Design a protein around this ligand. Structure first.
Ligand SMILES: [Mg+2]
Ligand SMILES: [Zn+2]
Ligand SMILES: [Zn+2]
Ligand SMILES: [Zn+2]
Lengths: 53, 158, 108, 971, 63, 45, 53
RNA sequence: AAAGACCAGGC
DNA sequence: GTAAGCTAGTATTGACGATACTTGAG
DNA sequence: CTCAAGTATCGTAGCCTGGTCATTAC
């Protein structure tokens, strides 16, 4: 979710670059998919399904 | 009734007389049916599932984009098992009018069996075909009876 | 929309169907699987001795679905051979995991 | 001095440095800019003075003085604003300059006379000096006409500075500028069985040639047949000359007596339709052979013309064919703009005189001269000819040709580059031509014989070679410096014979003779190599015709070559990277035209041809510079069939998606496409090393395997990798612009309702930046006041996110708006692709990564093609490129274990000097691979080792602009 | 415009290796030796760095 | 607040009517619509 | 110029998009068995052995 | 509206 | 009213079928 | 007093679909 972009690159370029950066994932076997989580709506930080950056 | 132009690709794992049709094409072309006995429940299921696009009782074309009585015209969308007929634009393709059975997919092309390249003299390097959709019932009988692949199996040139 | 990956619909995960022309013969249809499960189940059924036919097939290479066909002798049945293959595969995977954990703890 | 001690690699390095200096000094669009610059600096004044003065009589005379042009400016306020071409593009204006002339009328002030369009990067452009408004990828050479970019296509005409010998009635013809200058000598029967006689068609009047001989001043028949100089024998020639004598005597009674023949040509000229306003003596001094002084010289030139006809008759001379390019001149912007401006200047003067002639009858009451001359005639005529394409006919009056002005394409920078380097032979009915559609051997080095269209314009439209130059007119006099090399005068006695001497001809005009011709030519060429003769001067020695021809006119095609005898002057020099001027000034290089090259032995580029045997006078810089700019960069281009090279270099490289621009914020094109990550190839041709440009290539380096894939790549289909596409291979951005205009009633506004679908619109009638517009929405709201509006709606397949909204206005009161929509596409299942060897195809299947067949390092393909495509298309170079590229991206395993492991790596694949297959396979063997180019692979679905070895390697692939979702239609 | 985060074919992280490769080229290395010292072994990963065109610098000037 | 900028200098005009399309501080006739403040959501795919 | 954004990171697998794959390259190879018949190896002179190797 | 003119894809 | 200033006045890339005219002589 | 004929012209000569522009005011 992009608020300000004044660079010479467009937003899909930046989002596709951000999608491919590897994060540390040791929790991934213990958390659940977002199609299965009922404790939230997505759309923010919520444990077992989502992290906010 | 309707016509459609699209790029062709191949598919060797479906049947020879089958053609795959993109969903963007399929959900905007209609077939017309006259509602009467032996198809009240089968067409009622379709109108309940919002698969019939339009309607006309009598002549005043009321849209649906109503219960069924026997005697009006339902316009439903193309689904699996219908009959279209295919033609590459006949620049030299003098005898290439073929009748094929429809299945629907999600991609952007029209898929045909690779055995049907030489009856159409087409290849997969950018060629487009025209599909035509028969609306009248006697036209459906003529298309199914003269131009099917098993009917046209032995050539008439050689 | 990218959600129809591993979830099936209201169908069963596995559906059994015992064919009529040949006896001691069946075809198990498995939803949301592909070459990974089908190939090891096929090559584990060939290790069995009361199995005369074992083979798997995707009905179409763009569908996430397989069909597994077993023909057995009269000393066993298709369902026993299927379940024996699956249990043997679990015990082999457990043995492999214990060996790998031992070697990883050894290397440090 | 031997050239062996200079060495071959030194000479290759010098050839690369010299071509690099050429491209630094000239560029690729010098032939447009030089022609426009010559028209502005010289040709404009020549038009306005050659037009002449005039006097209206019902007296009042007018005279045109000198002409001035000033830079393009804007008078929006009463300030003078600088006018740049991007202002002209965005405001839908024409980018033009004002012309002023100062008149002198007597029965004196400066009057504005019109606006002439300005070529970008010329001497009138305001961008000549990371400026605001410029792209880095751009050179000049185009025009901005009503907001649109246009280019000139060069027009080919026949050379009229020579004689032309036909054979349909056996004609020989002299042409010139004036239509009253045409001179024809015909050999025919004007009637039994008459002997063939000689006739003159001068000023639309058939005259016997013997009468014209005695009219010009000859005294005897023996000195007249000395002027013809039969070379003896040939009884048909003697029969024709005695028949022409006794036919001359059968028309005038004793024409040989004083002024009888001259009185005869008086009464023969004067009786025609529209006789000239002159006596015959001034008619001869005006319209007979302009450039010669005495009537003695005109008699000598007529004898030379008759000798040429009789030599063609006997089979000792050939007839001229118009496919040999030594008989052709090429017309660019100056030659076309002069011809166009003469028409509308005459139309201005004609409606000036019939406007002055009323008020002059009407007492002085004469106005200032700015009233009697309308300036919009020239201004409207030039812009109408630019915006419609209809130029003027070269020689027909009142006619209009059509293939002159084209549109500039901006799909990639290579399409713009090759749209500026074209040449055309226009023909009457397209479909019945001679050898016009074919390569002639006089195209060598100057036009590409591999790349051409394939539609109706096949062969009729040509492309310039890489080192090709179009000459320009030399303004200094050159005839007085010819005497210093051993040329003598042409005397006036018509009684002295000139046997053994060679004739010299300067632009077709006979100006002298020379005794020794193999010293005259070799001294002129030596004085040209030391910069005291002009560099664009063509000298041709002709042994059979006994003739020396010299050309200094515009429109000749030149190219540079090494001069072998001056080639030893490099050793003693210093190998700092040269200028082209310094190599020209030392005689190492020369510019050579088509006719001079017929006297040249040129070694074939290869220094190994030059230095193994020295029987040569020149040598090429490289053989691949024989091809055009899109054909010289193709790897192994002499290894493929010619239809495939034509497909790649004329069609597929103009449709590739790559680079677009470096300043997209001021480009409101209809379509703009661009890759996310453009790459360059792995191989290095000579032209790509010399131009140093990356925007010649538009595509990606995909790893290709040659294998069957479940029957999904038959009939020229391809299979792609899903995971390579998700990581951004062949990912494309696309921007489309939607434009609308109003007068400054209909206006821009919110339309106050949802008749279409209005969600993102503001009060002004345009959406916000970043809106997500859908098919069926309203992109531009033109609310007609109090309703009944005409808005612009997106069609059934037009989507996107709003990138910018631009609002512009005009100078004549008109408002424009442009809205741009951004889309991002990865390849779908009917998108079109092609390699660099003409193997086009469609994407037919997208496969998962773990289903692909893999190598012992885990490399999977990105693209899989069918092996049935190779034995049938005749493109073997695609296998040799992939085997070369794999050898240059692999690590050298260091079996030797030395320092310079990567020193002897082969990476060029230049056309006509490709590496041999032993070098490519030795490079693959040093990298640890099989020489045949294939490798063992494991099956991806089952894990088994596959029985067949598979050819794999990187190929440069291109994503073309034909996409599947744009071809879907339903009626 | 900028170097891609991962190799197209295999998926190895290469997006933090461009300035190091330019620094090694600036100290008079061959391209093969500049890729050897930086850890790239498969030719699919090496052709990502040998063939990259760095268009971001030209985009930064022309606005 | 729909405001425009000048593509030559950068002066932020505020057009609300339909008189002409022109700057004040330059006199040139090219203006851009300014990007206001709002959040747009994308997939990182 | 300025960049300002907020991201949501979730769990997924490489079959859905290649950004969720943890392997830059996983592969195996068959182990080979090589026999050289030494009774036919003596028949070769050593420059022919170098030519073979 | 109607024709010209251009370009592309096929045959 | 534009006929396409007057514009040449034959004086330069097309080339065949298809129809229509000014001879001698039975 | 008409056939043939030797020119004398006429007129079509690749064709079809797409997308596009730019269209004299007097
Ligand atoms: Mg095709
Ligand atoms: Zn949650
Ligand atoms: Zn890789
Ligand atoms: Zn301003």
């Amino acid at each position: 979710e992009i608020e300000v972009n004044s660079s010479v690159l467009n937003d899909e370029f930046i989002a596709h670059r951000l999608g491919l950066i590897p994060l540390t994932s040791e929790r991934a076997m213990s958390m659940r998919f977002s199609r299965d989580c009922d404790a939230c709506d997505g759309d923010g930080q919520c444990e077992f399904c989502s992290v906010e950056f | 009734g309707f016509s459609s132009r699209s790029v062709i690709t191949g598919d060797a794992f479906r049947n020879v007389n089958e053609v795959g049709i993109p969903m963007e094409i399929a959900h905007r072309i209609t077939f017309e049916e006259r509602v009467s006995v032996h198809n009240i429940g089968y067409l009622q299921e379709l109108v309940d599932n919002k698969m019939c696009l339009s309607y006309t009782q009598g002549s005043t074309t009321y849209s649906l984009r109503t219960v069924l009585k026997p005697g009006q015209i339902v316009h439903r969308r193309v689904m699996d098992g219908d009959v279209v007929f295919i033609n590459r634009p006949p620049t030299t393709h003098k005898h290439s009018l073929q009748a094929l059975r429809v299945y629907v997919h999600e991609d952007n092309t029209v898929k045909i069996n690779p055995l049907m390249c030489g009856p159409l003299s087409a290849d997969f390097d950018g060629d487009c075909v025209h599909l035509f959709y028969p609306q009248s019932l006697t036209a459906k009988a003529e298309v199914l009876e003269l131009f099917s692949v098993d009917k046209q199996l032995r050539s008439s040139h050689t | 929309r990218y959600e129809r990956f591993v979830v099936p619909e209201g169908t069963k995960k596995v559906s059994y169907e015992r064919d009529t022309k040949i006896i001691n013969a069946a075809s198990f249809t498995i939803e949301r699987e592909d070459h990974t499960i089908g190939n090891i189940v096929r090559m584990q059924l060939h290790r069995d001795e009361n199995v005369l036919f074992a083979g798997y097939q995707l009905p179409h290479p763009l569908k996430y679905k397989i069909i597994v066909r077993i023909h057995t002798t009269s000393q066993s049945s298709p369902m026993q051979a299927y379940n024996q293959a699956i249990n043997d595969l679990d015990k082999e995977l457990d043995f492999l995991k214990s060996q790998f954990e031992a070697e990883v703890a050894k290397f440090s | 001095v031997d050239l062996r001690d200079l060495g071959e690699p030194f000479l290759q390095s010098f050839c690369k440095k010299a071509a690099t200096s050429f491209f630094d000094e000239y560029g690729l669009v010098s032939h447009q800019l030089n022609s426009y610059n010559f028209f502005i600096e010289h040709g404009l004044q020549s038009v306005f003075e050659s037009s002449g003065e005039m006097l209206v009589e019902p007296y009042a005379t007018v005279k045109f003085g000198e002409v001035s042009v000033d830079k393009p400016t804007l008078y929006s306020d009463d300030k003078e604003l600088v006018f740049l071409p991007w202002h002209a593009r965005l405001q839908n204006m024409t980018y033009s300059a004002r012309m002023k002339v100062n008149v002198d009328v007597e029965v004196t002030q400066d009057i504005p006379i019109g606006r002439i369009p300005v070529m970008v990067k010329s001497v009138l452009c305001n961008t000549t000096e990371y400026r605001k408004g410029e792209c880095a990828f751009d050179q000049g050479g185009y025009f901005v006409i009503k907001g649109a970019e246009k280019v000139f296509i060069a027009q080919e005409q026949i050379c009229t500075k020579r004689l032309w010998i036909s054979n349909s009635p056996w004609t020989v013809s002299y042409r010139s500028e004036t239509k009253r200058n045409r001179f024809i000598v015909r050999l025919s029967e004007n009637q039994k069985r008459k002997e063939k006689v000689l006739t003159v068609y001068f000023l639309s009047t058939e005259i016997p040639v013997w009468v014209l001989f005695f009219a010009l001043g000859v005294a005897s028949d023996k000195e007249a047949v000395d002027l013809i100089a039969f070379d003896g024998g040939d009884a048909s020639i003697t029969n024709s000359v005695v028949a022409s004598i006794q036919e001359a005597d059968s028309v005038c009674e004793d024409f040989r007596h004083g002024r009888n023949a001259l009185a005869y040509v008086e009464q023969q000229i004067k009786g025609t339709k529209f006789p000239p306003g002159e006596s015959v003596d001034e008619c001869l001094s005006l319209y007979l052979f302009p450039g010669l002084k005495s009537l003695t010289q005109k008699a000598r030139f007529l004898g030379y013309m008759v000798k040429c006809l009789f030599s063609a008759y006997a089979g000792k001379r050939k007839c001229e064919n118009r496919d040999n390019f030594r008989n052709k001149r090429i017309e660019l912007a100056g030659e076309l703009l002069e011809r166009e401006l003469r028409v509308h200047l005459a139309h201005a003067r004609r409606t000036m005189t019939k406007a002055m002639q009323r008020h002059l009858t009407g007492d002085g009451d004469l106005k200032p001269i700015e009233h009697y001359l309308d300036a919009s005639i020239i201004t409207n005529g030039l812009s109408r000819a630019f915006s419609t394409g209809a130029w003027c006919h070269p020689f027909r009056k009142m006619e209009r040709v059509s293939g002159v002005v084209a549109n500039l394409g901006r799909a990639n920078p290579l399409q713009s580059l090759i749209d500026l380097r074209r040449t055309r032979q226009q023909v009457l009915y397209t479909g019945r031509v001679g050898d016009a559609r074919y390569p002639h051997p006089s195209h060598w080095g100057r036009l590409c014989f591999l790349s051409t269209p394939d539609g109706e314009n096949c062969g009729l439209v040509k492309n310039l070679s890489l080192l090709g130059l179009v000459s320009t007119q030399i303004m200094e006099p050159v005839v007085e410096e010819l005497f210093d090399s051993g040329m003598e005068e042409l005397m006036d006695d018509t009684s002295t014979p000139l046997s053994g001497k060679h004739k010299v001809l300067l632009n077709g005009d006979w100006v002298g003779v020379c005794s020794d011709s193999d010293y005259f030519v070799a001294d002129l060429k030596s004085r040209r190599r030391q910069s005291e003769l002009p560099r664009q001067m063509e000298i041709k020695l002709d042994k059979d015709d006994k003739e020396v021809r010299i050309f200094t006119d515009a429109g000749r095609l030149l190219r540079p070559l090494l001069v072998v005898e001056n080639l030893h002057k490099l050793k003693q020099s210093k190998p700092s990277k040269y200028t082209f001027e310094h190599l020209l000034d030392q005689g190492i290089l020369e510019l050579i035209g088509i006719e001079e090259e017929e006297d040249c032995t040129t070694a074939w580029g290869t220094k190994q041809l030059l230095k193994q045997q020295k029987s040569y006078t020149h040598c090429e810089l490289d053989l691949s510079f024989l091809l055009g700019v899109s054909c010289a960069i193709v790897p192994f281009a002499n290894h493929d069939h010619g239809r495939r090279v034509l497909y790649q270099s004329q069609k597929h490289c103009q449709q590739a998606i790559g680079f677009c621009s470096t300043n997209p914020n001021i480009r409101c094109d209809t379509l703009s496409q661009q890759l996310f990550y453009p790459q360059r190839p792995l191989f290095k041709t000579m032209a790509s090393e010399c131009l140093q440009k990356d925007v010649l290539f538009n595509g990606q380096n995909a790893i290709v395997a040659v294998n069957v894939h479940l029957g999904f790549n038959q009939e020229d289909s391809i299979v792609m990798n899903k995971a390579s596409l998700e990581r951004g291979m062949f990912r494309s951005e696309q921007i489309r612009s939607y434009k609308a205009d109003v007068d400054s009633v209909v206006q821009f506004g919110k339309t106050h309702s949802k008749i279409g679908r209005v969600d993102s619109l503001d009060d002004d009638g345009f959406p916000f930046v970043g809106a997500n517009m859908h098919s069926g929405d309203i992109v531009i709201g033109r609310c007609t006041e109090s309703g009944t509006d005409h808005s612009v709606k997106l069609k059934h397949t037009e989507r996107g996110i709003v990138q910018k909204v631009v609002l512009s206005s005009n100078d004549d009161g008109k408002n424009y708006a442009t809205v741009s929509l951004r889309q991002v596409r990865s390849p779908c299942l009917g998108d079109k692709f092609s390699s660099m060897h003409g193997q086009k195809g469609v994407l037919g299947y997208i496969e998962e990564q773990e289903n692909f067949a893999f190598t012992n390092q885990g490399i999977v393909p990105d693209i899989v093609i069918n092996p049935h495509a190779f034995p049938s298309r005749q493109t073997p170079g695609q296998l040799l490129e992939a085997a070369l590229s794999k050898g240059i991206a692999c690590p050298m395993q260091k079996k030797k274990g030395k320092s310079d492991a990567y020193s002897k790596v082969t990476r060029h694949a230049t056309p006509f000097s490709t590496p041999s297959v032993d070098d490519i396979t030795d490079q693959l063997h040093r990298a640890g691979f099989s020489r045949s180019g294939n490798e063992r692979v494991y099956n991806g679905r089952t894990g088994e080792m596959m029985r067949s070895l598979i050819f794999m390697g990187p190929n440069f692939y291109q994503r073309l602009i034909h996409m599947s979702e744009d071809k879907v239609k339903f009626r | 415009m900028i170097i891609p985060v991962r190799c197209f074919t295999c998926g190895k992280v290469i997006g933090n290796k461009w300035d190091t490769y330019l620094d090694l080229l600036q100290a008079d290395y061959t391209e093969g030796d500049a890729l050897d010292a930086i850890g790239l072994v498969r030719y699919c990963c090496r052709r990502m760095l040998m063939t990259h065109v760095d268009l971001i610098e030209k985009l930064l000037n022309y606005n | 607040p729909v405001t425009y900028v000048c593509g030559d200098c950068g002066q932020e005009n505020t057009l609300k009517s339909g008189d002409v399309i022109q700057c004040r501080e330059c006199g040139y006739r090219i203006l851009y619509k300014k990007r206001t403040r709002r959040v747009v959501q994308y997939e990182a795919r | 110029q300025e960049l300002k954004l907020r991201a949501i990171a979730r769990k997924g697998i490489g079959k859905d998009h290649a950004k969720w794959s943890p392997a830059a390259t996983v592969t195996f190879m068959y182990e080979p068995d090589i026999i050289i018949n030494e009774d036919m190896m003596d028949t070769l002179t050593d420059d022919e052995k170098i030519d073979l190797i």
